[PDB]
Design a protein around this ligand. Structure first.
Ligand code: MAV
Length: 308
């Protein structure tokens, strides 16, 4: 029971997935690298399989500085604590992987890291992600006629609902751990997610029809509570930032390389049917007003123009 005051220091992590998912692997890499790098003693306790809840729970735990010390979070699950951060990977922000990589290779997102630390007391220590989010539905959704009134779950950040509303869908901010039942029960017709998570949590079992809208390439900060990070000795702080940066690089190389491979695994196994969306690129014009308005409201117009 007896730990070092800021014998050993124990850092508690959370993941929604098992050991086979890129986020869990990224967190294990983080732990490995801190151990390699730190001339000192630290113990990591990673609680997997959503034992400690979902991201919407984790973010409040980190803001409070209790329960868990580190995890990975989607920007669009952080909006209640930092209204600007969902800009980081909002729908249709990135053109392709090359664009996404150019961003993560800079420090252009810095203003958003700063807001998260200031407003939410959550420290970004690296960036993983690299999955491509597509529509996943009970029945095929392949035209704008199909999309009109399409009931779908979105993450809670306002920008998510605003985007899909502009595409004429009917979004619903339903908890991630309630999606499978909500589809199975017909409350909604589908949701949207990347390959790795669809496969790992078996969402194809209730929603076997995937539409290649390719509307998000994920940016997934590796995060530590500000309360924990700021308490750590100065040398361990610096190690955590180095390990986080390297773990993020590892995780996003991993997920981005495996995304298409996993779509193919699910097709080959008869689990998914994959279809293109007719006139998909019309989507880009339709969502531009919503993107611009959001950026303007949070005073991030210049940040968005740079990214584009
Ligand atoms: O849609 C979601 O809530 C989740 O989807 C996927 O599991 C991941 O991108 C995760 O970071 C998100 O929180």
């Amino acid at each position: 029971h007896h730990h070092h005051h800021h014998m050993e220091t124990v850092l508690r992590g959370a993941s929604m997935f098992d050991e086979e998912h890129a986020f869990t692997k990224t967190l294990r890499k983080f732990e490995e690298l801190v151990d390699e790098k730190y001339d000192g003693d630290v113990t990591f306790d990673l609680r997997l399989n959503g034992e400690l809840g979902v991201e919407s729970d984790y973010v409040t735990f980190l803001n409070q500085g209790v329960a868990i010390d580190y995890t990975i979070l989607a920007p669009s699950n952080m909006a209640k604590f930092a209204p600007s951060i969902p800009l980081m990977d909002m729908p249709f922000l990135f053109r392709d992987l090359d664009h996404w990589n150019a961003v993560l290779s800079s420090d252009v997102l810095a203003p958003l890291e700063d807001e998260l630390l200031e407003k939410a007391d959550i420290k970004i220590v690296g960036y993983t992600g690299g999955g491509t989010r597509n529509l996943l539905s009970k029945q095929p959704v392949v035209t704008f006629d199909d999309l009109k009134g399409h009931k779908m779950r979105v993450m809670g950040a306002p920008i998510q609902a605003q985007i899909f509303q502009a595409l004429t869908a009917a979004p619903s901010a339903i908890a991630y751990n309630e999606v499978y039942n909500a589809i199975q029960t017909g409350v909604i017709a589908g949701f949207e997610n990347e390959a790795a998570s669809i496969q790992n949590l078996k969402f194809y079992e209730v929603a076997p029809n995937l539409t290649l809208t390719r509307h998000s390439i994920t940016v997934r900060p590796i995060v530590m509570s500000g309360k924990t990070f700021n308490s750590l000795p100065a040398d361990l702080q610096a190690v955590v930032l180095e390990a986080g940066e390297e773990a993020g690089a590892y995780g996003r190389e991993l997920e981005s390389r495996e995304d298409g491979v996993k779509l193919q695994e699910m097709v080959d196994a008869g689990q998914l049917t994959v279809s293109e969306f007719e006139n998909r690129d019309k989507m880009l014009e339709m969502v531009k007003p919503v993107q611009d308005a959001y950026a303007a409201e949070i005073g991030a117009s210049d940040l968005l123009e740079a990214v584009r």
